[PDB]
Each structure stands twice: as structure tokens, then as C-alpha cells.
Design a binder for this molecule. Structure first.
Ligand SMILES: CC(=O)Nc1ccc(C#N)cc1
Length: 291
């Protein structure tokens, strides 16, 4: 799977909100492009002159994420974040020249990402009461990853002493994206756990935070809520469910080639952090069948 890299695997089966610190600093921003940010402005003008209904939006930028020594007391993760935008993403990560910007950043800053917007995404491994995970089919008419399988998620928009409000917005945003696209009541969802962070090498290394969320509804009830919105209530074109039993070997299935990179990251991290038991009971052969 060369199109996804793991940046972070969380300990303890995943981290809750109260164990994460954020540092939001202009030191964590993208560096100005070598020949100037006029190249980003030119791409944006070309795009608005064809699609004048498009609008910019601010985004969080991932600089890095440092885990505490395992088994320690106190905060377990530090997220180093800056600010970016949907315009800066289109002019850098989405540019045909994105590989040239990665080489230049290695040369100039010793950092392949230094000249890239790198907006932070969020995604969820969303489990039902009857032990399935939730998948969504992407429209074949989008420009990115057309027709591929996704999980619920999105790219959160801004508004430890500004830090704790930023961590709150990240955790809130993954629940809001489930409510908006799957049409589930907020009170049927658990507080999220952070499983880790995955990078999309097909989009010049931009990262997504991947979370585990439990729903109190069955697969049949989730399907009814999604469909009862009608075609205008969702961006996806369909919903479907895979037993958690069968997610373990998903990389060996024909479904794997249809999954977009950020969804592959969610499933790899679900399998390593929520699956993969360490104790004698769940590790016994009848409960963890060999192969
Ligand atoms: C939703 C989608 O198709 N992809 C996407 C959208 C916005 C950003 C940003 N900024 C990055 C990727």
C-alpha cells in the first residue's frame, strides 16, 4: 500500500480528548514558495474564472505529532498545528508540480512538506451495535478519487490555552461529519477515540486523524436513517456495512482496490489499535483464528 503511510499509532486502544494537547503556532505554517505565493494566486484566479461559485475556507495544517513515552501519566500526545486554506491546498498538494515542491522542501528546509498546505482531515471507523463498520460510495463525478469507497469524515474549519479549544473542535468535527452525512442523531454516538494519523501519498502526503466511534443503532437502523434523508441529504451515492470479523482480512479482498487512501488509513489503524488483541482470552485460537 504505497499510497498510505502511518505517521502515528496511538497506545491504549486509542486516546480520548482529555489526553491530547495542541500547540497552534504560525511557526507550524507552510513556508512561502521559492518564487513567491503568486503561483497559488494564479491557479486560484484560473479556477474562479471557470467556477465563480467556489469559495475559500481556512483549515488546520498538520506540522507533526509527538507521543509521550508509553505507560506515562499526564498528556499522551502533542499535536503541532498551523493554519492553511482550501486555496493553498489547490495551489500546492493538488498542483501537477506537487512532487517538485516536495523535492525543493527537502533541499531548502530538510522537510518534504515545507512548501505544502497539508490540511488536516478527520475520518471515522464507525461501528454499529450489531458489530459492522460503515462504508460510503463516492460520486463518479467528483474530481478526486471518483467512484471509490470512503468512510465518514471531512476537513474541519478553525472557529494549551488556545490548544484545548482546538482539540475540542477536532473531536466535535468527526461527530458533526457523521451527523451531516449519515443522518444519525448525535445522542446515538460515543465520544471518539483517536486511533492515529495516516498520510495520503497520492495527495503529496497530506494527513488525516483517524478516530473510532461506536453507535447504539444496528446496521439496519443506520441504513434507514441515511436513506430517509433522500439524495440531497448526502454527498455519497450509497451506504454499506462489513462485519468487524471480516475487516481483519479486508486488505486481501477485491474491496481494497476500491478504497480511497484516507479510508485505507482508517481501516489499517482500526485493525492495529482496536483489533490485534494482546491478552490470553481474546488471543486464544477459537477467538483469534490463525491466518
Ligand atoms: C473533500 C475532498 O474531496 N477533498 C479535499 C477537500 C478539501 C481539502 C482542503 N483543504 C482537501 C481535500
Amino acid at each position: 500500500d504505497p499510497e498510505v503511510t502511518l505517521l502515528l499509532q496511538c497506545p491504549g486502544g486509542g486516546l480520548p480528548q482529555e489526553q491530547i494537547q495542541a500547540e497552534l503556532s504560525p511557526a507550524h505554517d507552510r513556508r512561502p514558495l521559492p518564487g513567491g505565493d503568486e503561483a497559488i494566486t494564479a491557479i486560484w484566479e484560473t479556477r474562479l474564472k471557470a467556477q465563480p461559485w467556489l469559495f475559500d475556507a481556512p483549515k488546520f495544517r498538520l506540522h507533526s505529532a509527538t507521543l509521550a513515552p508509553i505507560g506515562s501519566r499526564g498528556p499522551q500526545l502533542l499535536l503541532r498545528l498551523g493554519l492553511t486554506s482550501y486555496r493553498d491546498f489547490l495551489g500546492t498538494n493538488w498542483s501537477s508540480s506537487a512532487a517538485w515542491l516536495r523535492q525543493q522542501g527537502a533541499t531548502d528546509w530538510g522537510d518534504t512538506q515545507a512548501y505544502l498546505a497539508d490540511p488536516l482531515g478527520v475520518g471515522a471507523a464507525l461501528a454499529t451495535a450489531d458489530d459492522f463498520l460503515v462504508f460510503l460510495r463516492r460520486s463518479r463525478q467528483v474530481a478526486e478519487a471518483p467512484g471509490l469507497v470512503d468512510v465518514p469524515g471531512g476537513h474541519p474549519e478553525p472557529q494549551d490555552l488556545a490548544g484545548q479549544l482546538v482539540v475540542h473542535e477536532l473531536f466535535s468535527s468527526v461527530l458533526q461529519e457523521i451527523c451531516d452525512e449519515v443522518n444519525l442523531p448525535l445522542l446515538t454516538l460515543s465520544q471518539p477515540l483517536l486511533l492515529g494519523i495516516a498520510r495520503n501519498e497520492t495527495s503529496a502526503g497530506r494527513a488525516s486523524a483517524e478516530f473510532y466511534v461506536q453507535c447504539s443503532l444496528t446496521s439496519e437502523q443506520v441504513r434507514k436513517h441515511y436513506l430517509s434523508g433522500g439524495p440531497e441529504a448526502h454527498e455519497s451515492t450509497g451506504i454499506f456495512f462489513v462485519e468487524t470479523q471480516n475487516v481483519r482480512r479486508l486488505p486481501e479482498t477485491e474491496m481494497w482496490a476500491e478504497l480511497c487512501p484516507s479510508a485505507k488509513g482508517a481501516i489499517i489503524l482500526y485493525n492495529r489499535v482496536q483489533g490485534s488483541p494482546t491478552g490470553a482470552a481474546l488471543g486464544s485460537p477459537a477467538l483469534l483464528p490463525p491466518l
